[PDB]
Amino acid sequence: STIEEQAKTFLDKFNHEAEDLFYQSSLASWNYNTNITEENVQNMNNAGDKWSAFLKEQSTLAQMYPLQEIQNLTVKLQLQALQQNGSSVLSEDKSKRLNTILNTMSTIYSTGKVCNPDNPQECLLLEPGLNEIMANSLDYNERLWAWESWRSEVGKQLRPLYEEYVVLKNEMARANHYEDYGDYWRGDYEVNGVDGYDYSRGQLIEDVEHTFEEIKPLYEHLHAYVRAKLMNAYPSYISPIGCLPAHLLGDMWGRFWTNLYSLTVPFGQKPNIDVTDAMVDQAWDAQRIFKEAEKFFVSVGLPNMTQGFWENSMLTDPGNVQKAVCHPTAWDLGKGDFRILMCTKVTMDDFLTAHHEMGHIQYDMAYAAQPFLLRNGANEGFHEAVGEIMSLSAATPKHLKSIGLLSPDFQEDNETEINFLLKQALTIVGTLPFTYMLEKWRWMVFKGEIPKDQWMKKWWEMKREIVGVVEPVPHDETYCDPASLFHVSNDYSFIRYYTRTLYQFQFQEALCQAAKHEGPLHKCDISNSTEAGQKLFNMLRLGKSEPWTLALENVVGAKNMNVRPLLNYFEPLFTWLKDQNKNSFVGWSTDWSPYA
Amino acid sequence: TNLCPFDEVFNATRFASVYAWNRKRISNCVADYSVLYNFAPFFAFKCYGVSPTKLNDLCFTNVYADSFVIRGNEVSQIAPGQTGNIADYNYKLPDDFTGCVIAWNSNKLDSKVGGNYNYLYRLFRKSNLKPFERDISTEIYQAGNKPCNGVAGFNCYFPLRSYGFRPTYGVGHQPYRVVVLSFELLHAPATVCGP
Ligand SMILES: *[C@@H]1O[C@H](CO)[C@@H](O[C@@H]2O[C@H](CO)[C@@H](O[C@@H]3O[C@H](CO)[C@@H](O)[C@H](O)[C@@H]3O)[C@H](O)[C@H]2NC(C)=O)[C@H](O)[C@H]1NC(C)=O
Ligand SMILES: *[C@@H]1O[C@H](CO)[C@@H](O[C@@H]2O[C@H](CO)[C@@H](O)[C@H](O)[C@H]2NC(C)=O)[C@H](O)[C@H]1NC(C)=O
Ligand SMILES: *[C@@H]1O[C@H](CO)[C@@H](O[C@@H]2O[C@H](CO)[C@@H](O)[C@H](O)[C@H]2NC(C)=O)[C@H](O)[C@H]1NC(C)=O
Ligand SMILES: *[C@@H]1O[C@H](CO)[C@@H](O)[C@H](O)[C@H]1NC(C)=O
Numbered sequence: 171s172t173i174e175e176q177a178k179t180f181l182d183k184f185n186h187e188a189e190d191l192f193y194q195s196s197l198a199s200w201n202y203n204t205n206i207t208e209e210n211v212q213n214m215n216n217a218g219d220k221w222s223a224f225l226k227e228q229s230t231l232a233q234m235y236p237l238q239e240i241q242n243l244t245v246k247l248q249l250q251a252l253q254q255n256g257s258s259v260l261s262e263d264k265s266k267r268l269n270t271i272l273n274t275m276s277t278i279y280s281t282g283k284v285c286n287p288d289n290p291q292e293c294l295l296l297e298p299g300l301n302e303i304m305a306n307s308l309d310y311n312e313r314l315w316a317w318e319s320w321r322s323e324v325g326k327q328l329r330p331l332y333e334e335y336v337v338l339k340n341e342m343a344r345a346n347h348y349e350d351y352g353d354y355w356r357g358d359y360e361v362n363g364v365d366g367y368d369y370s371r372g373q374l375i376e377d378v379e380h381t382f383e384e385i386k387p388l389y390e391h392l393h394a395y396v397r398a399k400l401m402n403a404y405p406s407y408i409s410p411i412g413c414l415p416a417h418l419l420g421d422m423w424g425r426f427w428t429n430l431y432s433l434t435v436p437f438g439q440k441p442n443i444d445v446t447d448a449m450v451d452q453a454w455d456a457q458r459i460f461k462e463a464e465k466f467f468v469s470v471g472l473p474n475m476t477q478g479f480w481e482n483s484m485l486t487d488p489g490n491v492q493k494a495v496c497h498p499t500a501w502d503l504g505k506g507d508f509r510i511l512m513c514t515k516v517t518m519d520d521f522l523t524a525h526h527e528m529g530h531i532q533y534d535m536a537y538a539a540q541p542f543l544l545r546n547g548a549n550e551g552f553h554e555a556v557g558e559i560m561s562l563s564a565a566t567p568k569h570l571k572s573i574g575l576l577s578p579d580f581q582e583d584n585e586t587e588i589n590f591l592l593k594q595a596l597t598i599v600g601t602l603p604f605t606y607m608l609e610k611w612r613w614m615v616f617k618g619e620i621p622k623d624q625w626m627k628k629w630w631e632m633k634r635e636i637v638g639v640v641e642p643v644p645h646d647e648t649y650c651d652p653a654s655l656f657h658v659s660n661d662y663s664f665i666r667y668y669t670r671t672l673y674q675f676q677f678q679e680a681l682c683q684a685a686k687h688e689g690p691l692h693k694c695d696i697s698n699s700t701e702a703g704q705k706l707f708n709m710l711r712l713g714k715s716e717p718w719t720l721a722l723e724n725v726v727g728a729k730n731m732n733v734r735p736l737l738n739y740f741e742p743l744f745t746w747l748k749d750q751n752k753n754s755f756v757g758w759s760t761d762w763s764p765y766a
Numbered sequence: 767t768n769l770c771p772f773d774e775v776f777n778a779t780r781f782a783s784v785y786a787w788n789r790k791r792i793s794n795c796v797a798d799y800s801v802l803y804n805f806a807p808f809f810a811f812k813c814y815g816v817s818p819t820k821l822n823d824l825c826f827t828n829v830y831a832d833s834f835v836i837r838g839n840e841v842s843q844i845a846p847g848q849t850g851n852i853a854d855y856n857y858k859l860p861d862d863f864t865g866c867v868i869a870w871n872s873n874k875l876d877s878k879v880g881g882n883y884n885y886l887y888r889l890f891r892k893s894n895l896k897p898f899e900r901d902i903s904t905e906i907y908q909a910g911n912k913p914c915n916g917v918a919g920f921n922c923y924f925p926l927r928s929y930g931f932r933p934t935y936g937v938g939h940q941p942y943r944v945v946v947l948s949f950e951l952l953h954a955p956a957t958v959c960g961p
């Protein structure tokens with residue numbers, strides 16, 4: 171018997187073994203997230219421990235099948251994922267060293283508190299304490315305190331750990347035959363052995379930077395418009411030509427400019443579309459929100475949710491005594507068990523989230539027939555991209571009118587579209603330079619292109635140069651400001667949010683093209699369009715079986731990540747911003763900082 | 767009026783694992799096939815070669831009811847010319863199979879919150895089964911070229927894997943009880959009619 175058919179048989183054993191053990195881990199995790207008791211923690215960890223221990227055993231046994239003598243390229247993919255997982259690549263001490271560093275950094279982030287001046291009694295966590303300040307406070311000094319306090323008393327804690335975190339992660343990636351830990355992360359987009367669809371790890375850098383260059387005009391005009399609106403509200407604090415202060419961007423880091431909408435709304439007299447009242451007027455409950463969300467995917471030829479979805483999911487907060495983790499999540503436990511965990515309120519926000527999370531389910535149900543190791547999005551950005559394009563269509567006035575949540579008397583004028591698109595750009599466009607610059611900094615740190623004595627120096631040079639954002643307080647190398655963000659300290663790749671953003675507008679534009687949608691892309695609803703659903707399903711069913719370049723092609727007809735549909739989405743805003751910045755300076759100076 | 771024991775086959779408390787599929791020979795009795803409707807929606811009541819529609823006034827030499835349990839997605843494999851883990855390694859029907867295949871959901875019975883590992887299936891076998899062949903051997907499957915020595919290890923897999931039926935499983939993975947009525951026709955007295 172050959173070495174390939176041995177591996178085919180090995181994966182056959184693994185899949186049946188993995189699905190059963192993964193279901194136990196997932197169901198125990200589900201029971202904790204819906205019923206918070208110390209037993210449910212113990213059960214969840216007990217099944218979680220048996221799951222990781224199962225994978226480490228199966229990863230080591232997978233390494234005994236060498237990849238080079240396997241031609242099937244679907245066995246090779248499944249084995250490659252299994253062999254890659256095994257972190258026996260590092261010494262158990264260094265593996266234990268790193269895990270303690272990861273746990274300490276995660277604990278420092280999640281439990282890190284800061285207490286106010288002239289009163290050491292009242293202390294504030296990031297959630298909800300400091301996040302509430304950075305999201306709602308209009309007071310410059312209060313936001314400056316919460317911004318500086320978080321980085322000085324939590325970021326400085328994370329600096330010595332992150333330095334060693336870089337050394338061990340690089341040591342792991344190098345012995346995994348990657349250039350560095352950043353090269354390891356970019357391997358999620360790597361494709362080999364497929365003629366015409368291959369994709370190198372370094373090509374992601376070229377593609378991210380190339381697509382980002384086409385974003386800069388849209389961002390610079392959005393940055394200039396946001397700066398002009400903020401400068402009106404903060405004349406003494408913001409230069410008309412300088413970067414935006416980092417603490418005035420609507421959250422702790424400027425990751426999203428969403429909460430600048432109040433100070434940057436183009437037409438504050440326009441009331442914004444909120445069907446929350448109409449839902450309460452029609453006595454909508456949470457089950458109605460998902461039943462309508464279900465109906466949305468049925469309208470595009472996607473199956474209605476399984477019976478186990480309705481019986482076993484949690485769509486309301488159990489409230490009272492029984493505690494639950496209310497973060498909206500779509501659960502694919504395997505074995506045909508698809509669940510959504512959401513504490514749904516009767517609001518437009520949760521209504522969109524239900525479509526977004528059920529979009530994840532539709533993805534999960536589509537590739538359920540795939541092998542277990544291929545049961546995932548085509549790459550890290552695909553799954554969340556599928557969810558976003560559901561809220562895009564669900565939030566359009568055309569969709570809201572067709573479902574009785576928006577009166578036909580309502581008529582959208584060109585101003586409410588600009589108001590909507592501006593709010594979208596603050597979140598969607600505003601995160602792109604933040605996302606690219608942060609991941610670039612990590613890529614250069616892992617590459618060694620930034621010395622330890624220049625981490626914060628480069629980090630804020632890139633913030634000024636790339637994001638147009640300036641630190642309000644000079645930061646020495648005792649600070650670790652990137653680690654003050656969850657993804658950096660909790661060891662999560664970040665370029666996925668850049669690629670997913672571009673993917674979702676590639677997805678929507680292709681689906682709206684399939685939906686025969688006439689008009690601007692941002693008004694598009696793919697509802698009642700089975701052509702769009704089949705086009706989307708052609709990629710959803712693939713999962714990880716096929717290269718993400720081909721999976722993208724099954725929707726948009728292009729093998730590579732493209733930024734043009736994103737600019738198509740925001741084009742009415744882009745033309746509006748350029749006119750609105752006709753007597754304003756577009757761009758920013760890095761030499762200006764709010765500390766004279 | 768000596769009534770055939772379809773009660774013992776269909777209604778039974780615990781069905782056999784599909785790798786060790788049960789077989790109950792039925793002879794010298796009246797076969798009231800209208801009782802064979804528990805009416806609880808039989809996922810499959812598809813018969814081959816013989817019409818199910820009120821065609822029980824026909825007589826057969828012997829009737830073989832093969833009862834077992836599989837999951838929902840594998841009920842398709844209980845049919846002539848079908849392939850997959852069940853048809854290849856657990857229960858194979860001939861291409862010219864003359865008989866009925868009756869399957870229904872048994873999630874209420876054969877599932878368990880902690881997982882029902884009673885029902886097994888054959889995951890590996892050196893070759894496909896002949897029609898109506900049964901393999902209950904638990905010899906460790908040798909995938910590699912090294913001797914297994916009767917224990918599990920690298921390239922040495924225990925041939926049987928459990929379903930782990932849980933009530934929360936999707937329909938495709940839910941337990942389904944299956945009865946396969948085989949109908950024999952020899953140059954023989956043909957001692958099963960059921961008018
Ligand atoms: C790489 O390996 C996979 C399997 O790991 C190959 O897919 C499998 O290909 C076989 C045929 O070589 C399929 O068996 C056939 O299935 C159909 C439908 O059930 C049935 O009608 C036939 O009688 C036959 O049994 C099998 O279904 C298919 N899928 C799986 C999951 O095994 C794949 O073709 C290989 N690719 C290359 C390039 O070698
Ligand atoms: C929204 O639409 C209105 C009406 O189409 C625009 O107002 C017109 O703008 C043109 C300039 O191209 C003027 O010549 C007209 O006199 C304007 N009409 C009125 C009634 O004011 C308005 O400019 C648009 N605004 C935005 C932000 O797109
Ligand atoms: C299995 O047992 C059930 C009863 O436990 C049988 O269902 C009965 O079938 C008869 C015949 O048509 C009906 O008159 C009864 O009303 C049914 N009762 C119930 C509770 O369903 C069923 O037929 C049995 N199956 C076999 C194959 O013997
Ligand atoms: C929650 O768990 C406790 C003990 O862990 C159990 O007694 C209780 O019935 C559970 N309740 C729900 C709603 O799951």
Ligand SMILES: *[C@@H]1O[C@H](CO)[C@@H](O)[C@H](O)[C@H]1NC(C)=O
Nearest residue numbers: 468471472473474475476477
């Ligand atoms: C919806 O679910 C039911 C479940 O009984 C199923 O019969 C039906 O085919 C599903 N979808 C449609 C479009 O009917």
Ligand SMILES: *[C@@H]1O[C@H](CO)[C@@H](O)[C@H](O)[C@H]1NC(C)=O
Nearest residue numbers: 469568569572573695697698
């Ligand atoms: C979809 O079709 C249904 C049924 O014809 C109709 O009631 C609904 O308004 C349509 N919605 C859209 C967005 O086309």
Ligand SMILES: [Zn+2]
Nearest residue numbers: 526527554557
């Ligand atoms: Zn999501």
